[PDB]
Symmetry: C3
Subunit: 276 residues, 3 copies
């Protein structure tokens, strides 16, 4: 499939909750909060009204990367955009399509791989909040953008993936030939380098090449640092066939200390070449 | 407006001098130096002759990124390009437009977001000199490149912004609809992530999509290490509006430790919604 | 001169062996294996069968970036691709050209600057093998790609360039007007920024602008991290003349610690400006 034009206006509830293990999360539902928070997909031109209810005991906020929002939706202590504890506040994210300005210049669309995260917990930059798991993927499609069969989010949050314990995964699961979207986010103090076995992508907006004239580098290794966001797609097993395809931070310490996961690509039999 | 064709020759005089302690600037007039140094603005094809007088009591130099210079302008003790204390030397920067070679291959233009820094003070790679603030923005335009209303230079130097103490800014002030050009330069030991609230830019030469077919990633956040140089223009408050829009390093401790500042975008009447 | 279309089948023999002190390397020749390991060049579509012979007494393997390889050629302990001590094993790399997919999307080719390295020695991720010098360049070319006169590989491995001691270089040699290719691979714990004096390139697959309409920023400085891989081509001293043009890591304490070397560009004379 390809994505349609936007303009639709969505109403979402987002709850800021303490998880059973004392972590923090966004969720569409009271008690259902996940780390990472839920995926939010918009099409260019869409508008999202998110009413945030903060159940914590500390002021918490909602900040987004790359979408259009006014100073009142900033999510910051600075701009008085945060949510006092047991409070609720509606955030408004806006999105626009590429086009020409009055002078003739080209205006860049909102489309890309983005993320939302808390800006007020533990410090005025959300250091406490980010550490404890308040973050999530935001994806903005452009009219005509190829769409996946699945999206998977991997956040390198300091030394952990998705605030999972070391050597935890996650593993993701696909069958040969599915189109698989990967959204990569990074947080904390450290730089990483993201690697995937048996697959490669294009370093550009969509991780997909236009046609024969796209100069973009093809790479299976991309260095990243806190709050970077990118994504790409893959045809699973393309040319490499089924199996367990490792993905990991390539900083050698981080890898040995367990920032690793598995991309389990299955034969159409739903069978996988025998692994460890 | 837009950048015209280059080829004009320029003469400029740079002084290397101490200001406060732990700080050494470049400046166009004696006593007038700053951190960062003056912006040098060229069009592709222009030549820069820069007269440099070293008022420091140790050797200092001029070394530039991306522009053409011969070995004699290198800026290094290696190539004996340094400036003796109290002395003077004239550097040369050439610049060229893109074009076909004889073999028919494409030779790239000089244009881009570049910078100069001292290569000999405190070490042979200018460790001492860079730390104390000898660095500056160099911007070379391609004919047809858009010109900004204002240009602002944001340098991340180790843990400080433009060698300003934590939480001291700098702030940057514009008005909605202004085309504000930023040039971002990193120096020192550490990588960073430069981020800005409410705005975005292309990841490419000019930081501006050439049109609908530009594949470049649109981004509000970029990893950068020492000597990295990039630039872009935004329409101030475009799609977002008046407000005091943070920029900062996104490394968690970095932003908490005071690498923070404001792009302060006013209304047409001077209004910033209260903060 | 330009690369042709691929599709050949290749057979290459690689020896993992222990070098003079505690050091490990890949080699074509039994006994003279080098750090970094031998350059492997391919045209898009080339199929390469590589026999590996492991002369060490711990397991060891071969793992490549970007090329098509099946799970049995992974080079890992979990996918059961590691080579027992004394044993030999054949790894298959495969390559393909770009073209319209079944769904009419454009499938990316394999062309680019890649590397191989060890995924087994000392850890599941080969930290010890990589540290000890098991790593080396791969270059996959597209039909039409411009060929160089010479190819140099610079590897940043932790704090050492190509496993040489600090301040030992390597230095590379060229005549003005040479078309010189540099492959740059990074490994270890650290990030660097690769700087080159008097020479600039384009950030993209080949390092060279495909024409006037390639938006890619032009750079002399690029931040990199473990397993990152790129490469480019310059014309020796184009616009800047002969001389000794430093290259180095521009992380300031890394410069000082000796990640530094020379691009020595001679006149057709054979003469070089002094340094
Ligand atoms: Cl709705
Ligand atoms: Cl989700
Ligand atoms: Cl023009
Ligand atoms: Cl410090
Ligand atoms: Cl590091
Ligand atoms: Cl020289
Ligand atoms: Cu912020
Ligand atoms: Cu890591
Ligand atoms: Cu953020
Ligand atoms: Cu791996
Ligand atoms: Cu240098
Ligand atoms: Cu920082
Ligand atoms: Cu420099
Ligand atoms: Cu370094
Ligand atoms: Cu690798």
């Amino acid at each position: 499939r390809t994505a349609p034009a936007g303009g639709e206006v969505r109403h979402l509830k987002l709850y800021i909750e303490k998880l059973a293990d004392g972590q923090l999360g966004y969720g569409f539902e009271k008690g259902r909060a996940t780390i990472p928070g839920p995926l939010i997909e918009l099409n260019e031109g869409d508008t999202a009204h998110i009413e945030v209810e903060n159940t914590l005991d500390v002021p918490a906020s909602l900040h987004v990367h790359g979408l259009d929002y006014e100073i009142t939706s900033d999510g910051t202590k600075l701009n008085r955009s945060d949510v006092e504890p047991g409070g609720t506040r509606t955030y408004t994210w806006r999105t626009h399509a590429p086009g020409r300005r009055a002078d003739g210049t080209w205006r860049a669309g909102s489309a890309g791989y983005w993320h939302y995260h808390d800006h007020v917990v533990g410090t005025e930059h959300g250091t406490g909040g980010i550490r404890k798991g308040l973050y999530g993927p935001v994806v903005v499609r452009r009219k005509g953008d190829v769409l996946p069969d699945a999206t998977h989010t991997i956040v390198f949050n300091d030394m952990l993936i998705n605030n999972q314990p070391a050597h935890s995964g996650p593993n993701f699961e696909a069958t040969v030939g599915d189109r698989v979207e990967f959204v990569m986010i990074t947080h904390g103090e450290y730089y990483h380098t993201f690697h995937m076995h048996g697959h490669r992508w294009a370093d550009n907006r969509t991780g997909l090449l236009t046609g024969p004239d796209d100069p973009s580098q093809v790479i299976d290794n991309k260095i990243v640092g806190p709050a970077d966001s990118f994504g790409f797609q893959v045809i699973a097993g393309e040319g490499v066939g089924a199996g367990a395809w490792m993905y990991h931070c390539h900083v050698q310490s981080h890898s040995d200390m367990g920032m690793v996961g598995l991309f389990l690509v299955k034969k159409k039999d739903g069978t996988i070449p025998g692994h460890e």
